[PDB]
mmCIF file with all atom_site columns, C-alpha atoms in Angstrom:
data_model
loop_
_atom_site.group_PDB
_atom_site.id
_atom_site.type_symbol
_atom_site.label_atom_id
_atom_site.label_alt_id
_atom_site.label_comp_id
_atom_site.label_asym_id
_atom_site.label_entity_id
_atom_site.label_seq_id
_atom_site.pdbx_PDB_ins_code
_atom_site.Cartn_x
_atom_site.Cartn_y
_atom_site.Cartn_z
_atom_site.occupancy
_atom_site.B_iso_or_equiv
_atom_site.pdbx_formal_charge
_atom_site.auth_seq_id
_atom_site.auth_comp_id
_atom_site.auth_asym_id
_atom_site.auth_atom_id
_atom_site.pdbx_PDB_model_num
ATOM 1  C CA . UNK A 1 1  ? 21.918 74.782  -27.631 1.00 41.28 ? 1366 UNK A CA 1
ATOM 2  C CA . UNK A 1 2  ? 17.902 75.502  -28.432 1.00 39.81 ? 1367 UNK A CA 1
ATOM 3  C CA . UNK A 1 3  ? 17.222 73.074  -30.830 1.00 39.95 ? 1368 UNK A CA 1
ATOM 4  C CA . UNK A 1 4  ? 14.569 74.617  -32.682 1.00 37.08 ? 1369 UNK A CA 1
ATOM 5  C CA . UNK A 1 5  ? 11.620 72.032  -33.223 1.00 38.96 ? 1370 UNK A CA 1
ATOM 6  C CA . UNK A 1 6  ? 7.685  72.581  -35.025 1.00 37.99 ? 1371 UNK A CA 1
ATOM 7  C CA . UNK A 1 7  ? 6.411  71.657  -32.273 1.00 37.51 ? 1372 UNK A CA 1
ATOM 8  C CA . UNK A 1 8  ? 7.911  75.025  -30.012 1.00 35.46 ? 1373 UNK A CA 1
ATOM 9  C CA . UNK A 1 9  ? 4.861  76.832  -29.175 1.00 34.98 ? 1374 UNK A CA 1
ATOM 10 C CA . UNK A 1 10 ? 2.241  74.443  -31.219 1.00 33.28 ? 1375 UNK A CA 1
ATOM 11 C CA . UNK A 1 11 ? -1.049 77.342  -30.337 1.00 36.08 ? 1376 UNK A CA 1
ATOM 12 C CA . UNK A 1 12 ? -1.771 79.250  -33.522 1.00 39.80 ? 1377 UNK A CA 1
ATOM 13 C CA . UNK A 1 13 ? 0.598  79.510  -36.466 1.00 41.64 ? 1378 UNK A CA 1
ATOM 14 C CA . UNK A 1 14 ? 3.330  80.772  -35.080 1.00 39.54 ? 1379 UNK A CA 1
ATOM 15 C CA . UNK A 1 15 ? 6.678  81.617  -36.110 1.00 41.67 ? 1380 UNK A CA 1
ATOM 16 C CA . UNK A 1 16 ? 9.213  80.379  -34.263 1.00 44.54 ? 1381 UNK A CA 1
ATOM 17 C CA . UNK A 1 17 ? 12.064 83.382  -33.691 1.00 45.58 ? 1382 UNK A CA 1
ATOM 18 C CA . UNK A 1 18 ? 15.430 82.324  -31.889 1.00 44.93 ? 1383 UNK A CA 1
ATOM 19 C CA . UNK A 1 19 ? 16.961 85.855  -30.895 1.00 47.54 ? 1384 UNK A CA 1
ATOM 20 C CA . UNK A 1 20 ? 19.005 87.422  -27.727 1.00 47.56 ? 1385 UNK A CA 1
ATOM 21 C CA . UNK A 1 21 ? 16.439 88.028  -25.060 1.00 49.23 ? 1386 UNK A CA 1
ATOM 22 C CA . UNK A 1 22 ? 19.094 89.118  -21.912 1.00 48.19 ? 1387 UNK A CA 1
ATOM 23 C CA . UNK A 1 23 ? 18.981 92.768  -23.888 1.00 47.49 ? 1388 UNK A CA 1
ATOM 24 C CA . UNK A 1 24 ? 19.959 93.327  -28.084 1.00 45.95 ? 1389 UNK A CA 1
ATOM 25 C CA . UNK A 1 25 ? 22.839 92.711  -30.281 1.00 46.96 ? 1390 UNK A CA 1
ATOM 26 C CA . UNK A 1 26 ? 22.875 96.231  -31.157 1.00 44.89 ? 1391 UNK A CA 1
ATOM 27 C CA . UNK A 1 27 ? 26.593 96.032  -32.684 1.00 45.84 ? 1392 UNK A CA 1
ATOM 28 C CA . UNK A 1 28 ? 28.774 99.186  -33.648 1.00 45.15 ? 1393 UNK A CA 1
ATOM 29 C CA . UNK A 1 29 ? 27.914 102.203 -31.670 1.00 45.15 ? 1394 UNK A CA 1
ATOM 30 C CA . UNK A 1 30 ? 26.536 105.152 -33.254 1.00 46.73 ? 1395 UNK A CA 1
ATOM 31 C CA . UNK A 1 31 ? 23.498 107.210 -34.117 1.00 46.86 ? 1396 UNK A CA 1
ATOM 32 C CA . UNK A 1 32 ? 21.275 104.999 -32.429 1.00 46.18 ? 1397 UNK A CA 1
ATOM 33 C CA . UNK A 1 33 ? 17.879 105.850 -30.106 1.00 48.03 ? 1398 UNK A CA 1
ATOM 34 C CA . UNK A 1 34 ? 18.228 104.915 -26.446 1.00 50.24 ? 1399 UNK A CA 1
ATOM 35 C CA . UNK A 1 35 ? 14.372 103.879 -26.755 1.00 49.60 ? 1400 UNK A CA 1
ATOM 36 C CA . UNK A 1 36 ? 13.210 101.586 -29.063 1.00 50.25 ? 1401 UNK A CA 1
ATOM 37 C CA . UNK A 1 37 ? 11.446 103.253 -31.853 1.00 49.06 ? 1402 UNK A CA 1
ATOM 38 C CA . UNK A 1 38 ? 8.134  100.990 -33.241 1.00 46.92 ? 1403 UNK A CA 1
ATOM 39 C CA . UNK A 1 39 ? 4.399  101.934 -34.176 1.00 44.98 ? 1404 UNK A CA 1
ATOM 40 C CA . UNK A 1 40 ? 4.539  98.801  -31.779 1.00 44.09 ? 1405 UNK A CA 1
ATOM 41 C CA . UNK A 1 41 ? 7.513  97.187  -30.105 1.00 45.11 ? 1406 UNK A CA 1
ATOM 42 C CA . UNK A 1 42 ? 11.172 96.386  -32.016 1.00 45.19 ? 1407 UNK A CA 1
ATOM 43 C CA . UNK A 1 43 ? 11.486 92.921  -32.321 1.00 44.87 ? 1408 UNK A CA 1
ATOM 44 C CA . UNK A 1 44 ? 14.872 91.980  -34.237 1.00 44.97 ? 1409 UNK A CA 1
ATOM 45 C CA . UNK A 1 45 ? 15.263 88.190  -34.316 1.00 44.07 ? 1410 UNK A CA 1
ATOM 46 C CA . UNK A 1 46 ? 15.136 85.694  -37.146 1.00 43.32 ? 1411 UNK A CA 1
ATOM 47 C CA . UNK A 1 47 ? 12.837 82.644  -38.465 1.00 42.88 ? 1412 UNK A CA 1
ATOM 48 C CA . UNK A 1 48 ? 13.744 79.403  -36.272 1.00 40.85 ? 1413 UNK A CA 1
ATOM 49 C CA . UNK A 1 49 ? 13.917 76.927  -38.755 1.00 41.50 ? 1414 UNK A CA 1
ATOM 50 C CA . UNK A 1 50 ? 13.278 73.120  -37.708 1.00 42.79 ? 1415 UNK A CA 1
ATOM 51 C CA . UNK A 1 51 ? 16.210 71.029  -36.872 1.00 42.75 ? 1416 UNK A CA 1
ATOM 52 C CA . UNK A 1 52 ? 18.189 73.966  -36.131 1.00 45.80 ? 1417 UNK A CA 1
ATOM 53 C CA . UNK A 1 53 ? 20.293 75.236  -33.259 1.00 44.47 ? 1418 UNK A CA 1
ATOM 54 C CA . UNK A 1 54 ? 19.725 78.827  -32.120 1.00 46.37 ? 1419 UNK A CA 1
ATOM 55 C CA . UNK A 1 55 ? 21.942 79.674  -29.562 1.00 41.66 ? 1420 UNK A CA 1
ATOM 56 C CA . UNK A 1 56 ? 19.439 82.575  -27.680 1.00 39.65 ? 1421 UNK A CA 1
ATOM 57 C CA . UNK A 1 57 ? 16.154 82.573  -26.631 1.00 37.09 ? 1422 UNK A CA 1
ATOM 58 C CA . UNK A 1 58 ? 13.547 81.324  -28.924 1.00 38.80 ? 1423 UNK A CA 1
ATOM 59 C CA . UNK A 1 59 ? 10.099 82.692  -28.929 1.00 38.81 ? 1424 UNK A CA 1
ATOM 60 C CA . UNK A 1 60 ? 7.164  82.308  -31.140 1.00 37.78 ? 1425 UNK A CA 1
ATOM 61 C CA . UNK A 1 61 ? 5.816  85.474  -32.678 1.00 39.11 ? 1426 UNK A CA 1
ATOM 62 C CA . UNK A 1 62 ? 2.535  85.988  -34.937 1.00 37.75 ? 1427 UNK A CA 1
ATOM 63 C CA . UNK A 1 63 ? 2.995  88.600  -37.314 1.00 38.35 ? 1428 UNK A CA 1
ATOM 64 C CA . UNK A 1 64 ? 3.083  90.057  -41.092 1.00 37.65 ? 1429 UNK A CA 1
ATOM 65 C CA . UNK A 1 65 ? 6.389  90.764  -42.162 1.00 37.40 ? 1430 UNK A CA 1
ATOM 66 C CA . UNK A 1 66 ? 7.230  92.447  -45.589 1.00 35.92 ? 1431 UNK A CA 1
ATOM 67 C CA . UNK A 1 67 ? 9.933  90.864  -47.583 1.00 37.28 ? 1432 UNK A CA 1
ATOM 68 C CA . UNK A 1 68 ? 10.868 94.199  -49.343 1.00 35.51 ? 1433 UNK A CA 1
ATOM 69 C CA . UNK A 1 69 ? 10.659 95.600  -45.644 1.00 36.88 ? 1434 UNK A CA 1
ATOM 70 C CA . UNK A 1 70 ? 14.004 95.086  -43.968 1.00 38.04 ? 1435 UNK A CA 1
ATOM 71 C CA . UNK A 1 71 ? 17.746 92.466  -44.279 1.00 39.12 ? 1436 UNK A CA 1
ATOM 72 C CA . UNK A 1 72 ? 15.388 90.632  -42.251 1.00 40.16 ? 1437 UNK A CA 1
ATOM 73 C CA . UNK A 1 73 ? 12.073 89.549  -40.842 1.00 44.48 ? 1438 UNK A CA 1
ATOM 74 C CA . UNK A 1 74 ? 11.466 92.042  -38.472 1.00 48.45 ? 1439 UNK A CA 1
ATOM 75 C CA . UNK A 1 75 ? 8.613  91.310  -36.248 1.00 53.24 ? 1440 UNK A CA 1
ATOM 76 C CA . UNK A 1 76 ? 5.546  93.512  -35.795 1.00 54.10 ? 1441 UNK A CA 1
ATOM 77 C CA . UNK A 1 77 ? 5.134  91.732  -32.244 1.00 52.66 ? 1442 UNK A CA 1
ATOM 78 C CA . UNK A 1 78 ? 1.756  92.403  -32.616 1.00 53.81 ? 1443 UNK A CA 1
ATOM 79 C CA . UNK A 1 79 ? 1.269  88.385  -31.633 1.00 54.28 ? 1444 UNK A CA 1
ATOM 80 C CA . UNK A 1 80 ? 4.336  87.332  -29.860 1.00 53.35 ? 1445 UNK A CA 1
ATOM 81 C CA . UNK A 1 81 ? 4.757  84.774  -26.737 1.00 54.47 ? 1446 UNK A CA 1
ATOM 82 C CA . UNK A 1 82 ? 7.701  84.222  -24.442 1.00 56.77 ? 1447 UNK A CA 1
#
C-alpha cells in the first residue's frame, strides 16, 4: 500500500492527500451533478498522515481549508501536484 511518508512531495508545505484518483468514491446514487461543481476544482481526499497506509493515490495539495467548512478537509486545489 502507499505508505504515506513527510518526505512525499518535500517542495513547499504541502499537504499530503491520499484519495482515489482512477475517478471518485461518489457512494449512494442520488441528486448529484454530473460536473463537478467548485469556484475551482472538487478535490475530496483526506490529510495523509506520516507512517500511514493510504490505499489510493496520494498527492500533495497546498491549500486553506476551513474546519467549520465540511466532514472533511476539502481541498481548494488551488496548489495541488500529482
Amino acid at each position: 500500500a502507499t505508505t504515506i511518508g513527510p518526505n512525499t512531495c518535500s517542495i513547499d508545505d504541502y499537504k499530503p492527500y491520499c484519495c482515489q484518483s482512477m475517478s471518485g468514491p461518489a457512494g449512494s446514487p442520488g441528486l448529484l451533478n454530473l460536473i463537478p461543481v467548485d469556484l475551482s476544482a472538487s478535490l475530496g481526499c483526506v490529510v495523509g498522515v506520516i507512517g500511514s497506509q493510504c490505499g489510493a493515490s496520494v498527492k500533495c495539495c497546498k491549500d486553506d481549508v476551513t474546519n467549520t467548512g465540511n466532514s472533511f478537509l476539502i481541498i481548494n486545489a488551488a496548489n495541488c501536484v500529482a
